[PDB]
């Protein structure tokens, strides 16, 4: 979230009920962002994957509060969005059929992949398994490179 300044309106009614959870997310992100001297490239990437996961989880929590549980008012939701507590573009994808579990927006940026495809993590696990067993090899896909997503198709 963005720093509090004269531009910031007071947190709407109900913020204090959710604030402890948002503070735990903040603490986790505050530690993940640190420099940890990871020697290996693989571990280095996995440390950015933790940040992408935490960002997703915080937005997912707020999304569940507003759209699924109706536990917060629209004024609070709009404030959380304005204050960058939740990613509105990612929540916008979660509201669309077939994207209800999208890990991140980067995994659907077709323009940035070599083949113009989405990230492999969008493919339903059943289709990868069928292709692999037909081919006679195990499923080689484990975690995608942009974020450590292991599969985010709505069916999985």
């Amino acid at each position: 979230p963005r720093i509090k300044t004269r531009r910031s309106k007071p947190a709407p009614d109900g913020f204090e009920k959710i604030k402890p959870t948002l503070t735990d997310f903040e603490i986790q992100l505050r530690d993940a962002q640190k420099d940890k001297s990871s020697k290996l490239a693989a571990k280095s990437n996995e440390q950015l994957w933790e940040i992408m996961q935490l960002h997703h989880q915080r937005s997912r929590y707020i999304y569940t509060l507003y759209y699924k549980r109706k536990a917060i008012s629209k004024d609070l939701y709009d404030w959380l969005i304005k204050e960058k507590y939740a990613d509105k573009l990612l929540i916008a994808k979660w509201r669309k059929t077939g994207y209800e579990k999208l890990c991140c927006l980067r995994c659907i940026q077709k323009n940035e992949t070599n083949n113009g495809s989405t990230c492999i993590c969008r493919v339903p696990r059943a289709q990868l398994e069928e292709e692999a067993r037909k081919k006679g090899t195990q499923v080689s896909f484990h975690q995608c490179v942009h974020c450590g997503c292991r599969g985010c198709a709505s069916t999985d």
């Binding site: 696990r125 499923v139 997503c149 599969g151 999985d156």
Partner: peptide, 25 residues
Amino acid sequence: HFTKSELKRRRKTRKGDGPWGSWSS
């Protein structure tokens, strides 16, 4: 092809919740 109940079952075998829940076992 799989049925919706089979998908629910398989989905619940993932070690951990959300997109990062592992399939390795």
